[PDB]
Design a protein around this ligand. Sequence first.
Ligand SMILES: CCCCCCCCCCCCCCCC(=O)O
Ligand SMILES: CCCCCCCCCCCCCCCC(=O)O
Lengths: 59, 57, 57, 256, 256, 59, 268, 268
Amino acid sequence: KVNSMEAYQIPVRSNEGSGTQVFGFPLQPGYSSVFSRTLLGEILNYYTHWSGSIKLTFM
Amino acid sequence: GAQVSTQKTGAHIHYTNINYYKDAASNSATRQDFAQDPGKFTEPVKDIMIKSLPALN
Amino acid sequence: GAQVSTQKTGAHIHYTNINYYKDAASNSATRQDFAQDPGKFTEPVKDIMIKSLPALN
Amino acid sequence: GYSDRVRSITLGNSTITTQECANVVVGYGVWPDYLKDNEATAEDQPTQPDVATCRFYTLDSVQWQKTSPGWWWKLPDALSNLGLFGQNMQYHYLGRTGYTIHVQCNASKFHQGCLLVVCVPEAEMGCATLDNTPSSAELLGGDAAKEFAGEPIASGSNKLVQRVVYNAGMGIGVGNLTIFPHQWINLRTNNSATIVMPYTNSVPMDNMFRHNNVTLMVIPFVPLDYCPGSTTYVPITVTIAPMNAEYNGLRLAGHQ
Amino acid sequence: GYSDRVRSITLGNSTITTQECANVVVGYGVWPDYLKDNEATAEDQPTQPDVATCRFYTLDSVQWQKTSPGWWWKLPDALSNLGLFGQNMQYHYLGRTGYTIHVQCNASKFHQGCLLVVCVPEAEMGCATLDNTPSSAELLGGDAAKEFAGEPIASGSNKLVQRVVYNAGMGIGVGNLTIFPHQWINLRTNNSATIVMPYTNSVPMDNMFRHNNVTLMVIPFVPLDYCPGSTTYVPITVTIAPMNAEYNGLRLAGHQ
Amino acid sequence: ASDECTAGGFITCWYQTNIVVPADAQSSCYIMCFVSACNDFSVRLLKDTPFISQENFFQ
Amino acid sequence: RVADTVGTGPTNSEAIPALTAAETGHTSQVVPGDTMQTRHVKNYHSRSESTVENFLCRSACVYFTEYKNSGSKRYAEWVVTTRQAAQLRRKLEFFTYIRFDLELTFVITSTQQPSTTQNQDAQILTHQIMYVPPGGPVPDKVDSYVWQTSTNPSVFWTEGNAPPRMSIPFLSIGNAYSNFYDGWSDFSRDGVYGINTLNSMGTLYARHVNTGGTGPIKSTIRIYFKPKHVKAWIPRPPRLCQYEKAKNVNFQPSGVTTTRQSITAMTN
Amino acid sequence: RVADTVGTGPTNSEAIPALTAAETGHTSQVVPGDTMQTRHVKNYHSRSESTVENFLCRSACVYFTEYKNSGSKRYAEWVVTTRQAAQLRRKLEFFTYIRFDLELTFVITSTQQPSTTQNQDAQILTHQIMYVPPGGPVPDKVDSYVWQTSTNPSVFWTEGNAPPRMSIPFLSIGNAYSNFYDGWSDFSRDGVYGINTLNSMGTLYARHVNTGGTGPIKSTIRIYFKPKHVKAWIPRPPRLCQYEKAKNVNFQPSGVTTTRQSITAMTN
Ligand SMILES: CCCCCCCCCCCCCCCC(=O)O
Ligand SMILES: CCCCCCCCCCCCCCCC(=O)O
C-alpha cells in the first residue's frame, strides 16, 4: 500500500453487523509510522519536545 | 551610541549591544523576531468562512 | 545600562556588572540572597504556641 | 437569495459559469497585479495587450480511467502557441503574467472519485538516469498532456523524466503537496476547481521560453469507480486565462 | 446561512452531529433542572458528579427487519452498568436525573419506513397469566433490547410479560401513544429523533434500582421495505445522556 | 522520541451505524485523513533530524 | 506567546463548528472547546525556537579538502556549493526562495605523514586561503602571481589559535537565492537543465604558506556555513528522499512511509 | 545578619519557658536568656555562606572518559548523569526537588603512549565534543555524517589554552528536577522502578578532530558541573550510607554511628 496511492485511502464497506473498527493509530505525531512522514511529523523530527492539541480531518 | 534590549527569560534582565563595524553585515542575527501569520497558507480562499456555518450553502 | 551594587565586606565599596548576553542563562549566580524563614520546618502546627505557656492545657 | 456554490467569472470576451463550485482559492492571499515602478529593473516602456492576452483559453481534454496514475501540464508551455498571447511572448524577450486556472469534471451522482488540483512554483522534475538531466521533450508537452506513471521508470541510460506518482517527479511525498496552493474536486460535493495565482519569481521579469514559473498537476488520490451501465468515459477539461499580462524587449520572432 | 435540519449537541466530552433532524422535542416544555431547597425532603448534602455522569452513552444496536413487531428499553436499567453513572447509583440509596434520548437510523432514498420513538412515564407491563405479576428478567433487559411480539403470548401458567404490539404491553391502544412525548422518524424526511425529558416523579428523589421512571419504546407503524439488491440490513442505535444527575444516601454497594 | 514516562494516547474509529446504499451504487467507499498542528501547539530543543543521511559528499 | 484555551459549557445549537468542507481547501480552524467542554487554562508557552532565523542560525560543515606541503598536490581548490552536504541542503530546500548573509569559519588541522626521512625539525606551518570571483585568473602552480591577492580577499592563519572568521554580504544578481530553478541555460532548451544554471558563486583555494620540515605533512581544511539575517518565502514540502548528485534533484524512487503490520495495530 | 542576645535579670514567675511538649512536634524555640541571666551582646555574624546557592555554586568533576587517536576505540560516549560521582550526588540529594541552570567546563589532557614507531612528529591535536538530544542519530563510526553537527550543539578545542565553557538553560519536561521518584515506568507496575524512569538528558560524544603523529595518543576528557540560579524545596535527611549504583538507591545496611566505650565517657 505505501508503494501505491492506496496508503492514504482508508477502506470502508457496507457490513452485516454494526460496531466493526475502521482503523486504529498511535496518538503521537513524531514517532508513530503513520504520522512520521507528514508535514507536522517531519517538522517534529527536527525538535526534541512537542506540546498542544492535534486536529484530525476526515473526508 | 549603546543600545539596551531585554534578555530571553522564563515567565511566571537587559543586555547592552554596541556595533563596532560599519559594514552592517557584521552584526549579530535577529533571534528575537517572534511574529507569525498563518493567514497566507491557511484560509487562502477569497470569500471569508465563519467557524460554525455550513461550509457550502 | 550599567548596574551598581554593594560588595561583600566586613562590619565594625561598590562593583559594576554589565550583561553582554541576551540568553539570561549566561548571567552570574545570585550569591547575595540572604533571606531565611524557619516557620515552615519549625512551628509547623496550626494553633500558635506562646514561648512560656503550658504546651498542652 | 444567492448560493455559495453558484459562480460566474468574466475575463475579456470569455465567461465561465458553474452551478456547483468549491470556494475560489487565492494561493498566497495576493491578487495578480502589474509590476511597480519602484521595483522595475528595465528602463524601456512595457507593452500591455490588455483583453487580447487576458482571456480564457481551453486546452485538450483528457480521459479519467479507473487506473490513471496522473496528468500534469507545464502552464507556460501550454499557452505558448495559443492566440495573440502565444504570439506576444514569441515576439518579446521578457514577459511577466498572473494565471487563472479552472479544472472542470462532470459525473453522475452514482460515480465516486477524488482529484487533487495543485499548482506548484519551480517544480523541477528529476531524470530516471542519475547521470543524465531530463530531456526538454519529456519535461514539457505543447498542445498535449504529459502523464505520470504508476510504476517507477525502468532501468535505463537515456534522458527520461522520472514519473512515479508518489514522488510526483519532484522526489517529495505526494501527501505534503497541501502546502502548495490547491483545491480538491470530490464527485459527490464539487463540480470544478478555480485557483488564482499571483505572479511568483525572484526576478521581476523573466524570458518565458527558457524558464517556466508554475506547473499545474492533477492526481487521483481515490480511483474513479462506477456500477455497470453508467457512462464509462469521464472528461477533465483545463481552461487557463492570463491576468495583467505585460511584455518588454521587442525582438525578432523565435527562440535559440 | 443556517439549516433547521442540521444540529450539534455537546454534553461532557461527547458531541452528536446529524446533518438532517426533525425539530428537538422537550416533552412538557420543561428543561431538566437540579432539585429546589424549598422542595427537598432530605437534610444531607447531595453529591453532583457533574460531567462524569452527564455524558452520552451508546447502547447495543438492533436490526430493523421487514417483520419486527417492536424494540423497547427500560432506561434506568439500560445505564445501570455503564461508566461512573452506573457506579454512582450502585453506591447511593437515592438518585434523581434528567435524560437525553437520541435515536439514529440511516437508509437509502429508495428505502421506506416509519418508526415511532415515544418515552412513557410509569409504563407498567401486564403479565400474560392473570394470576401472576410479570417477572423482573422479562420486565427489564440489562445490556440488551427487549422485543415486542406481533402475536399475543400463548396460554401459560408462568411469569411472562404480555408483549402484543397493539396493546404495547400497557393494555392501551398503540395509536393514542401520541399524548406521551414522542418524535416520528420517516426515512424519506428524517435521519434521527432527539427527545429531552424533565425529571418526572411524585417523590423528589427515588431509589433507582427498585423503581424505573420512564421507558423508551420504538415501534414501526409502517414496515421497512426495499427493492432487491439494496442494503438488506438496517441498524437503529440508541444513545442516552444523563442531565443534572445528583446522588444522596452514601451506602455500601449492591441491592437487596 | 517515544518515552515510557509519557504515552500520548490511542486513536480509533468504529461504525456508529451500517453504511447504506441504493441498488446500482457501490457498497464500498474510501475515507482520507488530514493531520495538523492546532493554535496551542509548540516545540523546543531543536535537534538534527533522523531521516536524512549521506555516505559521502554528493557531486 | 502561544494562544490560551477558553473555558466552555455544554450547549445544543443550530451552529456546526466540527462540520467543514475539505474541497474549499481552507484548512479547518476549530479549538478543543468547540468539540468538548474545556476549562480556562493560561499558556506561558512561547513560539521562539520555531522562528526561521533560530532554525537556520547554526554552523554546519558544508565540505572539507586535503592538500600536501610536498609532492604533486601542493594546494586544494573547492567550488563554493551549499548542496554537497545533506543536512545543510535539506533545511535550505524547505523554502523555494531564501535571502541571507553568510558567516564563514575555517578549521585547519595538520597530521604528520609517516616517512623514511629522519631527525625532522618542524617550524609552525602558516596556511593561506584565497577566494577568486568568476573570471579571476586561477592559480596553475603553488608559486604563481595569483597568490599575491592584491585584488582578491584572502586570510593568513598561524597554527595554534582561534579559527579564522569572516562575514559575507548577501551576494546575488537576483533579488533572492533560488533553491530550485525549472529552467534551461539557453533559449533553445537543448543543454544542461537545473539549479546549476544559476550557479556562479566563485572558487576557494588553500595552500601551505611555508614548509616547516622535510617529512610530508597533510592538512585538512573544513568549511562551516551559518545563515544570518534570514528572510524566506514560498515554503516547500520535506524532501523525503536520499540525495544522489549536487547538480540535479535526480532520485531513486522511495516508498511513502515505514510499514505497520495492520491498519488496526498500534505497533510500527 | 544573626540574631543578637538580649540581657536578662533574675525573676520568679508562673511562666515556664524551658518546659515544653515533644508530642506536638513544634520545635521548642527558647533563647539562652530565658534559662539563665545573660548580658546584652550585639552580633555582626552573617548567615551568608549557608545560602543554598553558595553551598552548591562550586565546580565538581561528575565523570571522565578516555579515547584513542588510533586503534579500535576512536571516540568516547558518556550518558549525562549527576549520580555517578558521590560528592555531587550527596549534596543534590539534600533537597527532594531542585531547579537550577548548569555551567559546564571540559578539561582535556593528552598523554603520549609508548610505542615501537620512531622519529614521530606531532601537529597540535584538535578535539571535538558533540551533544546529541534523545532520538538524534548516534555516530556508529568516527568518520560518520553525525559529526557534521548542523542541528547539534558542538565545541572545537585546540590544545594549549583555556578550557571550553558553556551555560545551560534549565532543561526539564517537569517544573522541577526530581532527585527521588517513587514510581514505575509503566501503568502495570511490572518493569524497572526508580529515578532512572525520569532520566532522559541525552548523550555526549568526544573525538580527535585530527591525528598529529603516527604513535598512539590517549586523551582524557573531564566533565565539571556548577549549579547556578539555584531554587530548592522539600529538604531530605543526610544520606548516611556509601552509594552502590547510579540507577538505584540500593544500600548495604549501615550502623547508626561510630561507637564510644561508655554512655558516661567523653572519648569517641
Ligand atoms: C574570503 C574567503 C571566503 C569567500 C566566500 C565567497 C562567498 C560565498 C557565498 C556563498 C553563498 C551560498 C548561497 C546559497 C547557495 C546558492 O545560492 O548558490
Ligand atoms: C554542548 C555540550 C554540553 C551538553 C549539555 C547537555 C545538557 C545537560 C543537562 C544535565 C542536567 C542534570 C540535572 C540534574 C540530574 C537530572 O535531573 O537528571
